[PDB]
Every structure is written in structure tokens, then in C-alpha cells.
Copies of this chain bind each other. A is one copy, B any other.
Amino acid sequence: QQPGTSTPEVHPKLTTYKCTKSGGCVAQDTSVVLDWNYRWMHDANYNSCTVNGGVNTTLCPDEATCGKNCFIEGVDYAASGVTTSGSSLTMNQYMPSSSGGYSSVSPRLYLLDSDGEYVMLKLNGQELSFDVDLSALPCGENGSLYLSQMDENGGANQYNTAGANYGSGYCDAQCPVQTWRNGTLNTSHQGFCCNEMDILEGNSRANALTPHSCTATACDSAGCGFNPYGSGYKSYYGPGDTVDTSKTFTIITQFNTDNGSPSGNLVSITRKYQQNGVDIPSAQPGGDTISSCPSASAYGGLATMGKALSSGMVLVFSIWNDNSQYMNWLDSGNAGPCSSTEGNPSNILANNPNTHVVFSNIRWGDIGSTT
């Protein structure tokens, strides 16, 4: 697959920053990209190269062929519930349709850099900070801001000229088997494991910080995550609570090393919220931090994550609903006020089709410098 011509890819500009303890914060000429899978792809004669997410065997038998055969076109971000305003990103879960009422558009964005390659965030011994407006996201919705260890140029090769410009080469701790594994038509039917740091993953009812360490072969699927509600702080993060989701708040995640510097060794992942200028106090005394990561032991607990954060990671924006378990693992039962049923997407579409996440002012750098 190579760049198409019917619809040009014009990346929605999003301004991010890199703060240094001394030289403040610098504006970055970044932007967002829609994940490869959401695009239109076809041969010169316009027959589709895809078939229900899979490929057209005739046009896509091996790799060298689609490479020379198919073209993946750009998208209409607006129509995809993706919009930007300076240093602000707004993602919708649904969009009105010509046909019926609302169709579930579920964007998955990547922070692209000016050179046409994913911004390589190196957060080891540093901090990433942003503003969120989860007010819209109700029970069942999943707003998401996480780092994945993807190839900076979306694994673009001789047969994939699209690359990061078209969101090629996704991956996460779940080790997904994909039609296009790392920029190549996965002809070996293998999964794709890569480190995944899940900074924000939640809605207006609850949230969760979850680190996933990895081997070349596998990952820590169930992460050693932190959820105030799950940890018995049922009245900290929520509508009108300590953090108060009803309004905008700031999420500050610091990756602490043993030598206290980016030079090496991850030791803890410190979370600190702050709303209305004033710093919000921790849920658990001493600080909301992820020190020991039991689950990750079998994959080089923490050690590997930090090495991954050093090598550099891609930023991933996403909002989605669970048609299978209604995201109960995130906001229901013992980890959220939501009821087992309340998260049903159909019910979300019914009572709040206007749900959207609004990420704003994304800036990473030295600890304390991003503020």
C-alpha cells in the first residue's frame, strides 16, 4: 500500500510542548494522524483492497503485491469526530449520518511530527502533562491517552510508502494479530507485542493508570494498574468529588528514576492531579504512585518499561466503548460506581451520543517544568 490520490491526507494540527526546568515550554509543530485501519484503500481501478477489515486476496496475496497494488487514501477528520484548535484535541465517539442517526466513529490518533514521523516521546525520568474534559464521557466510555512502543515511521518499507503519515504500524500490550503487522501485510499471522504505558484510561466516573512491560514475545496483559476507586477511595475521582470530573482538571505523570535523571532506571510512576490552579492532594497518603509492579515481574518488571520509555514511544489518543463487557473492568463493580448494564454502548448512544473527550495543552519535559 502507498499514498492515495482521491483524498489527500491533511493532518489536523495540534500544538504540543517540550518544557525544560530552565527554558520554559517550547511550542511544537505537531499534529494528529488517524490509525491505518480507519482509511479507505484500493487498486488503480478502484476495487477495494479490504474486505470487512481483512484484505482482498486477489489484490492482496502477498506483500510485494499490495505494495504495488493498493493505495490508502486520507480521511475527513471532522467526519471522523476529530478536531483541533491550537493546543486542543476533541474526539467524538459518534457522528451523525446521511443514512441513519449516529454511526460510531472511534478515532485512534497518533502524535505526528513535522518530518512525517511519530513524535518519539522519551519520558524516562521525566513528565508528561495535559488537561482533560471527561465531563462528556459517561459510564462505559473510555477516554484514552497512552504511549505505545511503535516504529517511528510506522514500519514503512519498500511496499509501504504511507508509513506514519497514514497511521501505519500500531501495537500495544494486548499483542494484537493484525492485517497489517508493522507496515507489512501480516502474511505470517503473528501478533504484535510492544510496550504500552497507559497514562489516562477512563471516563467521568472512574479512571486508571496502568503500565504494561514487555518481552519481544509477550506482554503483561493485566497491568499493575492503579484505580482510586478500586483501591478503596470511592469518593476521590468523580462528579463533584475531590478531583471533580465535571470540570477540567490536569493530569501530571512523572516517571521517577533511581539516579533521579533520564540517564536511567525506572523506579516509580507518580501521579498528581491539579484543578483550578491549586494542587489536588493524593488519594493514598505519601503520593499516588506505582512503586512495585508485581504482574510485570515475568517481563522485567519496571526495568523494561523504563528502557522502553528511554528508547522513545509514540503517543496515542483514543476514545472507545466496549460492546462486549461494557468497559465494566474500568468503571463498574469494585472499580467504579457504574452498574453492570449502564455501560452498554447502545444505551450510551441512546442517552448521550454527544460524548467526546477534549485533550488540551499536551506538554512533556523535565519534572516540574511542564507545571
Is there an interface contact between A53 and B324, defined as CB atoms closer than 8 Å?
no
Is there an interface contact between B360 and A86, defined as CB atoms closer than 8 Å?
yes
Interface string of A318-329 (1 = CB under 8 A from B): 000011111011
Instruction: Please give the distance in Å from A257's CB to the nearest CB on chain B.
Output: 26
A99 within 8 A of B: no
Is there an interface contact between B88 and A190, defined as CB atoms closer than 8 Å?
no
In the complex, what residues of B have CB within 8 A of residue A237's CB? none
A85, A88, A179, A340: most-surrounded residue (chain B CB, <10 A): A85
Among candidates B19, B24, B298, B326, residue contacting A222 with C-beta atoms closer than 8 Å: B326
Q: In the assembly, what is the distance between CA of A143 and CA of B190, in Å?
A: 28
Q: Which residue of B lies closest to A297 (CB)?
A: B346
Q: Which residue of B lies closest to A63 (CB)?
A: B57
Is there an interface contact between B52 and A217, defined as CB atoms closer than 8 Å?
yes
CB neighbors of B among A267-289 (8 A):
276
Among candidates B27, B131, B186, B344, residue contacting A24 with C-beta atoms closer than 8 Å: B27
Is there an interface contact between B52 and A325, defined as CB atoms closer than 8 Å?
no
Among candidates B187, B217, B334, residue contacting A57 with C-beta atoms closer than 8 Å: B187
Interface string of A179-197 (1 = CB under 8 A from B): 1000000111111000000
In the complex, what residues of B have CB within 8 A of residue A333's CB? 328, 332-335
Give the interface SS of chain A, mostly helix, strand, loop or mixed: loop
Q: Which residue of B lies closest to A223 (CB)?
A: B324
Interface size on A, residues (CB 8 A): 58
Instruction: Please give the distance in Å from A18's CB to the nearest CB on chain B.
Output: 10
A10 within 8 A of B: yes
In the complex, what residues of B have CB within 8 A of residue A322's CB? 222
Is there an interface contact between A363 and B85, defined as CB atoms closer than 8 Å?
no
Instruction: Please give the distance in Å from A207's CB to the nearest CB on chain B.
Output: 16
A61 within 8 A of B: yes
Q: In the assembly, what is the distance between CA of A10 and CA of B278, in Å?
A: 12
Q: Which residue of B lies closest to A371 (CB)?
A: B29
In the complex, what residues of B have CB within 8 A of residue A339's CB? 334
- With contacts A188-B54, A328-B329, A333-B328 taken as known, whether A15 is within 8 angstroms of B87 at the C-beta atoms is yes
A221 within 8 A of B: yes
CB neighbors of B among A163-206 (8 A):
174, 177, 179, 186-191
Is there an interface contact between B87 and A361, defined as CB atoms closer than 8 Å?
yes
CB neighbors of B among A24-62 (8 A):
24-27, 51-57, 61-62
Is there an interface contact between B340 and A334, defined as CB atoms closer than 8 Å?
yes
In the complex, what residues of B have CB within 8 A of residue A344's CB? 222, 295
Among candidates B24, B329, B340, residue contacting A230 with C-beta atoms closer than 8 Å: B340
11 more CB-based (< 8 A) A-B contacts, given A15-B361, A55-B188 = A15-B86, A19-B27, A25-B27, A54-B177, A54-B191, A57-B188, A88-B88, A179-B189, A222-B324, A332-B334, A334-B339
Residues of A within 8 A of B (CB): 10, 15, 17, 19, 24-27, 51-57, 61-62, 85-88, 131, 133, 174, 177, 179, 186-191, 217, 221-222, 230, 276, 295, 298, 322-326, 328-329, 332-335, 339-340, 344, 346, 358, 360-361, 363
